[PDB]
Amino acid sequence: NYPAEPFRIKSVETVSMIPRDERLKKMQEAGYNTFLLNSKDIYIDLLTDSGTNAMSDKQWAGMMMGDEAYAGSENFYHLERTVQELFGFKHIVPTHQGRGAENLLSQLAIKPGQYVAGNMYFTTTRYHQEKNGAVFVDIVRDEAHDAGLNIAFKGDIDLKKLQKLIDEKGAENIAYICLAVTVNLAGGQPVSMANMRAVRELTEAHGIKVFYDATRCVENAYFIKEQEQGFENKSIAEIVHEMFSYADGCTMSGKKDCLVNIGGFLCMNDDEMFSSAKELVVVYEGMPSYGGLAGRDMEAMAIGLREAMQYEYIEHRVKQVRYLGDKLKAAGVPIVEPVGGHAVFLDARRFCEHLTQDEFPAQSLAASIYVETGVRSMERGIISAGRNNVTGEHHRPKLETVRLTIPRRVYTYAHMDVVADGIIKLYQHKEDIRGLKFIYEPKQLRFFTARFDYI
Amino acid sequence: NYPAEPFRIKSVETVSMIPRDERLKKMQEAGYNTFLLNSKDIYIDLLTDSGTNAMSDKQWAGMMMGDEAYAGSENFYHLERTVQELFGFKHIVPTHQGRGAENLLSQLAIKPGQYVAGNMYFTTTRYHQEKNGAVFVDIVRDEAHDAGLNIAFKGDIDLKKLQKLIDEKGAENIAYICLAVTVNLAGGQPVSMANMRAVRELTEAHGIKVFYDATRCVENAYFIKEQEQGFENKSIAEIVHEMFSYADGCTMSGKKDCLVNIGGFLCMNDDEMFSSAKELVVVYEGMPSYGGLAGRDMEAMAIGLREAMQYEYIEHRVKQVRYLGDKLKAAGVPIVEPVGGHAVFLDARRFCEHLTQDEFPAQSLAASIYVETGVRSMERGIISAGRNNVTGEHHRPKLETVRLTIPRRVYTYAHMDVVADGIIKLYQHKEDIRGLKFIYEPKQLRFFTARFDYI
Amino acid sequence: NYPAEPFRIKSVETVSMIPRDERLKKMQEAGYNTFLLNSKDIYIDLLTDSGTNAMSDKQWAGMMMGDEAYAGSENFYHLERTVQELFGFKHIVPTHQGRGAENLLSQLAIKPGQYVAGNMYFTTTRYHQEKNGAVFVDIVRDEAHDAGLNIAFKGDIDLKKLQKLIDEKGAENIAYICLAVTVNLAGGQPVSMANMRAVRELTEAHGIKVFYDATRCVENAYFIKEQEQGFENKSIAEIVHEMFSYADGCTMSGKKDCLVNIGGFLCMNDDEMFSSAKELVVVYEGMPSYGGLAGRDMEAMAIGLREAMQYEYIEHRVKQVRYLGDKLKAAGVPIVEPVGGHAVFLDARRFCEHLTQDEFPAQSLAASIYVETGVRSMERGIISAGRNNVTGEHHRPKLETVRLTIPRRVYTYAHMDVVADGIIKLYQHKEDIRGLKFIYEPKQLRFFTARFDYI
Amino acid sequence: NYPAEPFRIKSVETVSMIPRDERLKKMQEAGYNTFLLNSKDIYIDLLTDSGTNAMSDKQWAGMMMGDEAYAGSENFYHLERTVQELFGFKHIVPTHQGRGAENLLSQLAIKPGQYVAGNMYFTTTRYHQEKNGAVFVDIVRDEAHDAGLNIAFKGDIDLKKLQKLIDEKGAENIAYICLAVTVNLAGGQPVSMANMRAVRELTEAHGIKVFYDATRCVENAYFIKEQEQGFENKSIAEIVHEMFSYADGCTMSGKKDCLVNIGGFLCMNDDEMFSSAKELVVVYEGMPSYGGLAGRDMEAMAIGLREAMQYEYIEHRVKQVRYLGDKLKAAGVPIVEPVGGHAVFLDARRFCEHLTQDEFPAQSLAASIYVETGVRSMERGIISAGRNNVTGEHHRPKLETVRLTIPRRVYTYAHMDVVADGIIKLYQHKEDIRGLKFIYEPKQLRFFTARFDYI
Ligand SMILES: C=C(/N=C/c1c(COP(=O)(O)O)cnc(C)c1O)C(=O)O
Ligand SMILES: C=C(/N=C/c1c(COP(=O)(O)O)cnc(C)c1O)C(=O)O
Ligand SMILES: C=C(/N=C/c1c(COP(=O)(O)O)cnc(C)c1O)C(=O)O
Ligand SMILES: C=C(/N=C/c1c(COP(=O)(O)O)cnc(C)c1O)C(=O)O
Ligand SMILES: [K+]
Ligand SMILES: [K+]
Numbered sequence A, B, C, D: 001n002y003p004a005e006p007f008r009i010k011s012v013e014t015v016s017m018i019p020r021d022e023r024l025k026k027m028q029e030a031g032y033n034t035f036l037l038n039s040k041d042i043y044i045d046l047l048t049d050s051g052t053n054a055m056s057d058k059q060w061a062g063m064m065m066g067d068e069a070y071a072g073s074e075n076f077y078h079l080e081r082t083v084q085e086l087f088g089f090k091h092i093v094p095t096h097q098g099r100g101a102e103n104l105l106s107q108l109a110i111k112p113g114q115y116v117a118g119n120m121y122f123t124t125t126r127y128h129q130e131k132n133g134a135v136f137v138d139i140v141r142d143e144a145h146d147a148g149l150n151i152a153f154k155g156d157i158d159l160k161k162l163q164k165l166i167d168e169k170g171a172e173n174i175a176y177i178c179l180a181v182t183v184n185l186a187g188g189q190p191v192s193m194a195n196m197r198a199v200r201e202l203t204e205a206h207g208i209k210v211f212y213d214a215t216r217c218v219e220n221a222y223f224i225k226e227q228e229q230g231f232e233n234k235s236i237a238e239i240v241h242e243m244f245s246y247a248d249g250c251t252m253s254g255k256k257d258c259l260v261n262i263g264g265f266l267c268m269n270d271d272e273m274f275s276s277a278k279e280l281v282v283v284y285e286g287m288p289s290y291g292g293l294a295g296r297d298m299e300a301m302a303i304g305l306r307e308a309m310q311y312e313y314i315e316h317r318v319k320q321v322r323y324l325g326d327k328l329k330a331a332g333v334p335i336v337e338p339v340g341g342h343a344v345f346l347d348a349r350r351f352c353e354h355l356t357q358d359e360f361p362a363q364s365l366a367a368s369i370y371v372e373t374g375v376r377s378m379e380r381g382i383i384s385a386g387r388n389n390v391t392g393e394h395h396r397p398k399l400e401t402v403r404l405t406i407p408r409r410v411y412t413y414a415h416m417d418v419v420a421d422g423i424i425k426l427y428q429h430k431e432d433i434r435g436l437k438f439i440y441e442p443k444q445l446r447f448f449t450a451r452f453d454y455i
């Protein structure tokens, strides 16, 4: 149903809300970009589930046993062994977080002019692919771009689209397939095991490599257990292990499903690629024996990845998100459906029908939720999508959304109720939300520090 | 109206989540005595609110700054400053917990044959009074002994009974008035400020001392703010300070309202008694500047007492307990009323009205509660009452209860739902609850290690 | 020789020294009692090895896994199992520190008017024995009272003295033998295994009980390994286990050799005594399942007791003390010999030859070492010895000493050099140290808070 | 004169203390490559001073107060304030460590074909300069290349070489001057304030930028205080602030002089470059307000940088390294001179003068050192120099050294004695040290995983 937390609270941090008049000053001081607000001025911080998780007593015990040696740290061996056991890959290179591993993969596996195809883009991933000379091709099925369509396993790759790509371009012009689990910008939507099998079968027959974005793979495994016929009595760990058996390697931001505040890694099976990866990690991250992490953080990530396999933990994690979505849907608030593993996405096009996407309604809605509730949320729409690196025009995604992102093990259902009640009230006078225009635009990943003004 | 938690989760404590059939085996291995269960086998542990609290990030930062010097630790001076500021007593002596301070007070303040009068009693407090020669007298208002009477400030002293004692025994033969806030034995019932001032006025005219058992004084202060006319504009801190302005000293268990896992202290205004207390603390506890605590623990207690003064924290603490009581009462489950600041007491005599008291209904209900939910609660009935070792017969208390004692900042409303739903389900077939019989009974402390089997 | 530290530094705390002019103000503000100086005004704090130790990374990991449950804590089970394994006693009752366990033993095992005989007195131990009606008899051999006499195993009981006691008083009038390892006030002097065997053999033939003061038993085991013929190839743990095989129980301050900042316990083999001990611990300390300690402190004590068994750790501990003694002796500074396990004792009678013991030269020397070096040390002489509870006169010990007490794993050899150099310079003008007289004297354990003035 | 540690030990790190014959087996299993040893097998780990430091109790308190928000963390604002105050730069961007900041600076400040000139180089710094199109020029004073020349401020830039570069290539073709403090590759040699001001004066007249590699800037500042006339009355903080007043920005590895285990940052004064840096940091590291660090780590680095300004701390840090160098030099052991701020370099070419460089004398000496003492040191000779993959021949460095790199606040003078005594003993029969040959050699990063056997 909605289960209670399968843990107790060991330690707390205080929350507080500043008056509406002062939030109004803060939002315009931040140029109406929620990324630019200060943590102390936020009451419930749903900007991201990345690095914001609460660790366990066992992880904090591991934090006291950091072996900070430059080479041969016990913490590295623990992390390496844990990932080999749970994911099944032959080799691991730690990185300080996920985009560090993406930096390595894109430099190792892309020849300029080749294609990289994935189930919907992501911001840092697509930037590193294009920066190294690849053309991104979206091979997610069309349904994943329709926010309201409630169907299972929306993250699945369209095998017909993948096949057409191989036929029009040729397999040797495809650097690799990028399969993300879950799919973040479709709403945290899962990929089925059947789809991972079929993608593996078709790519292998053409010699094309498959690399997973593993960042929310445990959430994805929960959906397989819950909804894919035949997996109902498999453990989360068995599902995770089988998932990665259809891949040649992975990038991972441990800051998501490894239940830590920093950390990531790169996995692969190929020996020559591992050799090249170790040469490159030294330049950007650190020695292959710590990869830009303190020993104590490799330890916490090794412990957290194993905690994430507990069924009751991930069931509660996902159903707590679902609770927030269910309360918003029962009141008529338009959301992306089905609710995904890590966040509820408000459909900003339906919330702000009076605005065109060129007026940045998602960015505008996020500012308004902060001013009316003190809750921080993130823009996931035209601002995040960036510009086309050939024409200079906005990428125009069908999904213009505002993300209420739930950190793991941090908030309660009563906090979800506070969030839901505040958004339901804002819905009543949604016509009051104004369009926005750029006054400062970065040349890449512009959503991080852009500044706006009301039209 | 039930407020959301005025904090978020910084770190979590692991639990195992064993299912019902396994919980049944654990309960049988414990001989159906919840006191014998292993902590690692318990999902929600409501045995006591003493020392089971979750600390904040600020307290844990203080735990890293323990000055472990034997004398003159900076942590002692921080604790001393905090207690002098918030409680307003001239002098303070730390103790390892509350019954350490009681040991000291009773040796300092009692001449043999004298009387100590209180608003009911607690077992350790009254033991140290009687061990040092005092005769205990209950001067609580008669209503406190009616567990179904729903009235405010049930812990108040009957001023008439106090006056009768003074007239019948003489002021010079009364060692002190022991005023407890809240009154644990009545179910955690508060005392009004008007009552505290009347007691201070009457005693001061006869030269009689008043010492507070201050263990849940912050919960008491919230009741004054919520329900006593004239205190709606006062802060929790202002109410706490005025409360102790009507006392000559106090004993304090930090393990309750100071939000720590260990610690207590003794306060007084009289220089002479302070001098004598310092001569005695080294006998049982330690130096006047650590009193049987590590430096880091004096530090955590100094920080936690100040955190307890936040209105939102204590409002939520008391209303979370109230939520559990309200939910049970709405389903018809019999409880002590009103609900107190720290616990809900089930009336097992009425819950298990098909069982006689010699079949230990509270002990059996507590066993059933664990089996059905994974919740541990405390027997507070005939078993805890002990046996008259002269005659061999049970002590038979009027109150036959199960205490659901709520640690501070550890559980959520969803955990409260687990507790309530399980008990409500048990109540709907309460006639299936079986009686218990002794299979092992020790000579003393029988509630701690006795084992039972079903009749 | 003098080995290097068999550990690395994991974390530090800053030290500083305030000018001589300000130390002079501090010492007279403290009434010339070093117990009354503030930790922040001390540069190197050698007041005591009690509770001042540095814990390890493994202990701090255990501190993050405190199971704070009132009954059935995993931390209690770990401590109980560790003590049963390493000491070999059947039963354990935790206490918040050593004098808590002494309080329990003295109340359990003493009938008023009986004799308790031990190898030299200690302050808290003797107070609890006399408070419960016993007469203390010293059965240490005479040599232990001669500071300069360098002989091995000065802590040994004189079997002839023990035999005479049995003959003059009768075995039934002796409550028990108190055997301390090491013997603190003789200078931290060890007891031989042969002596523990012989004491066991003679007491057992008369039905007299033997209880050990186990507080520095690991230091004592090191001396046995180093110097007792036949033990050179036994492990520290084997020696510890055999030592306690000659005892009926023990009191322990974990604050010494268990490498913690708080904690102790009481061990015994007799079932009825354990039953009585559990009834009494509830009054003074807490439930038998935590005994006045947080769960995390039972955990740290269980881990620390096992760390203490590492040969290289205890060898370095003892040889670091010896280094300080050797440097002082090489310069001609009079000390107690042989150097003991935990401290160097300056012979205040030889340091202050110009003073009589009634002028409290040890107390005076401690004040002077602070004023000239900022190092804190403790009086261990006529002030600590207290008054005779029949005549009212000073107990007059032959050992009038000032103790430089070394906390475990806190200071380096360079710190020892700083201490030695400062004391050697004070030695040059030792005639400048003045006699002291009481201006405030507590009625018991007077050394803790007494205030003095120069004669 | 060598000062005592200006701190005491708060907590210790466990080590195993394995004996010589077992250390020999560990060294053989590591193929005689110290880089392949397990940390758990090492007593004293002198492989690097990077990230191996011991933190204070205050830093660990800050570790409990990590604000893990994705944007606007309070810990970032604390770090920003601290760096602006102590270094005096207008703007700061955090990075996960030093080579992250170097990546950013080189992309921001270099147009392809331009020159970057420095006082020697470090491998990661120069890689990012060359990767972005720069041609490196060494402008250090010629004396820095004489490893036996005992003169002050060996890291100084030759102003004549700088002027020649400007005249020969033109100011518009020089991207920046890279001034390192200290100069790692010369053995940790400092730069004078007079040199920094002369470089700033000369560059400023041509519009050329100067950026500092600030990694060991506090050790540098101590040398200025100790040895540059006119700075004897200046605080470490005053010297640090003046140093950076001669730069346009810096790259900083907190893993060195900020006394942390992870962390770095980039500073600059130019608003435009700051804006561009913020657009780039999100590509590789993270948000401008966390830059690939956990909140708790920005907090530890803010606290640690301020602790590094204490004169007594940095005096003892540098003089502990000097102690090791002095002891070796007194016994005739050949070292690079003068001893630098962070390490002693053994001259393995002269130590093992019976071995040719093709027999890897530094690699073999480092193996022998571990076997005899349990000390790990780093090869800095022909193995680390790598192989010319075009021709197949070794890169043959003039310096064939073993680096004994000293982490901050981890070891004592007694540990330094273990290191020195072992090396001095080896030197007394240096002709017994055997040559090594490759048995496994990887194509790149060969010093990390190569394995050897004896000739
Ligand atoms: C920061 C976020 N995402 C990070 C992310 C990344 C990049 O990871 P780091 O933030 O750890 O670099 C990669 N792949 C996916 C699917 C991700 O969601 C976020 O969604 O808030
Ligand atoms: C342990 C409990 N009571 C402690 C207590 C105490 C004794 O405090 P310590 O447990 O800290 O000794 C004193 N006074 C009152 C009113 C108390 O409730 C309990 O109710 O479980
Ligand atoms: C405090 C000290 N001694 C404590 C002690 C005690 C009392 O322990 P607590 O301080 O843990 O109560 C008992 N027995 C011996 C031999 C002791 O040395 C000291 O010597 O500084
Ligand atoms: C890791 C080392 N050096 C780091 C370093 C770096 C790179 O810093 P990170 O290791 O923090 O990337 C930059 N500049 C200098 C002068 C350095 O010494 C070392 O010497 O072992
Ligand atoms: K590190
Ligand atoms: K302590």
Ligand SMILES: [K+]
Binding pocket: B050, B051, B052, B261, B262, C068, C069, C293, C294, C295
């Ligand atoms: K506790």
Ligand SMILES: [K+]
Binding pocket: A050, A051, A052, A261, A262, D068, D069, D070, D293, D294, D295
């Ligand atoms: K974070």
